[model samples]
Target chain A: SHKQIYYSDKYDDEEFEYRHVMLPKDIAKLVPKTHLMSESEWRNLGVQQSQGWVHYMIHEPEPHILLFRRPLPKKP
Target chain B: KQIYYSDKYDDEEFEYRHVMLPKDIAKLVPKTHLMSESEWRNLGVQQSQGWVHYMIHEPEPHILLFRRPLPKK
Candidate 1:
């Protein structure tokens, strides 16, 4: 089944826009299967190096959301 | 402007994807800027190590994409 992902650019400081991508039918097909874990649990995995960025996932409150981030370009 | 990206996972020698950036912003980043391989690496992007993920954004329908061998599992 495909899950919906809710995204927002606001909340917290405005360093850059944040995107929460939960496992959708499309994306889920690419990544491996794994249970949603707490921030601490992911950290404990020690596979942080393999992770591209410092994004996190929230499992509680239904619709697990994964933080998608891209550093905003510098001002000209 | 909104950016559209796509990916493929079919059996093949290579995979493909793209990114669409706005025209005004695209103008600032010329080809040279787009070829900043070393720059992305300095930031610790593994792609800097000969691994490239091509992305293309808007502006005259610019096409930016890249294909590399699969990553080591």
Candidate 2:
């Protein structure tokens, strides 16, 4: 609906900034944990059967999420 | 590395006040996008191929991150 305002802390003398948006609560659970997969792991899960992208959520200390991003499975 | 307190107040309460992040990683996520619950559903984001999606609501602002799933196949 509207663009949510988010702020990121600047890190180190190198200088860096990040702006983040809020995700709809309904699909919040879709997120996955950090480093849940490593390319090979995804293939092992039989994910190679299709095409998709690996998504990750990193909070650093605690509270992380991860998931698989792909097309809907075909139904007979 | 840097540290700061949360700028948000929930129920006039505060917790998890401590926060930190690497400057390099912080630079990678320079901005974030907003999506409504309906919009996300409509987008139909799902797991496939060999990757997934994730969300974050804490640790200073919100960020959407992507990574390769662990090798299993």
Candidate 3:
């Protein structure tokens, strides 16, 4: 089932303009929707380090750090 | 699809922590390491002022996570 993606899915953060999401390893599967992202996943997504940033935290039962991508904001 | 863990080796690597909500947004993230300064050197992370202020990710999300170099014990 799709629910198997995370042991527990508490990875929701609305700070970014994007909505909260946790998805399968295949992030591009979602067009405009972003997945709870990882470092290596960057290459697949085709965005450079300058465009996105990874935010960190852990989810448990068995702890593993979660990284989410935030589209960096432009300066004035 | 990736999450950092808190196994015995993990606690030594990361602190598993968090801070209060942000109205200023600047408080969202502003942050460690699991490797011995060499091994997991490949571990991917962005720095706060390039310091591994080691920002954390908590469930609430409103409250962000942060860790620091506590002068190793």
Candidate 4:
């Protein structure tokens, strides 16, 4: 059997980005109607059609993507 | 009576954006029901215990999302 494998033993303990997929139904609940477009029209827009679904890949070369950053730490 | 006391000026702003999802996939999610009122509370607590990750970016890019059932409970 031929196989290829990648190991992350070293950085396994390290924290990284968390990926989640949001389907049309899930998003409908999260957003308001004014903020949403009908499914067929949205499909026509091709946001999901091109990629299929919400996908997030690990952004390499950085320990973590900065969702937010701080200039200093808070006092204990 | 301290009326308009501080030297600090406070201002706030609000904005809104929209996202649209395709129809065929939207039908996949089955409706969920809680047996009792307290069950709903418990469910909310369980979900709240989970970690939240927020992403802030320009234009808040829109994308399609999908979810599949996990076999292992």
TM-score of each model, paired residue for residue? 0.34, 0.20, 0.19, 0.15
Candidate 2's iRMSD: 12.6
Per-prediction share of native contacts kept:
0.00, 0.09, 0.00, 0.00
What is the TM-score of each candidate's chain B when compared with the real chain B? 0.47, 0.23, 0.27, 0.20
- Model 3, B3-55: lDDT tens digits are 32111112554533332333344232333222232322233322232123343
Q: Please provide, for model 4 over A1-76, each residue's C-alpha lDDT reduced to its tens digit, 9 standing for 90 to 100.
A: 0111111111111233222222333233333223333445444432322232222232234312111111222431
Task: Choose 2 or 3, whichever is better by DockQ.
Answer: 2
Candidate 4 residues lying further than 4 Å off, grouped into runs, are: A1-13, A25-76, B1-45, B49-73
Tell me the TM-score of model 3. 0.19
* Total clashes in model 4, counting residue pairs 3 or more apart in sequence or in different chains: 3
What overall lDDT, based on C-alpha atoms, would model 2 receive against the true structure? 0.33
Per-residue lDDT of model 1, residues B1-46, tens digit only: 4332333332355543333344534454445444457643343223
Those runs of model 3 whose alpha carbons end farther than 4 Å from true positions after fitting are: A6-38, A41-62, A69-71, B1-73
Q: Candidate 3 iRMS, in Å?
A: 10.6
Q: Comparing to the true complex, what docking class would candidate 4 get?
A: incorrect
List the DockQ of the predictions in order. Answer: 0.06, 0.07, 0.02, 0.02
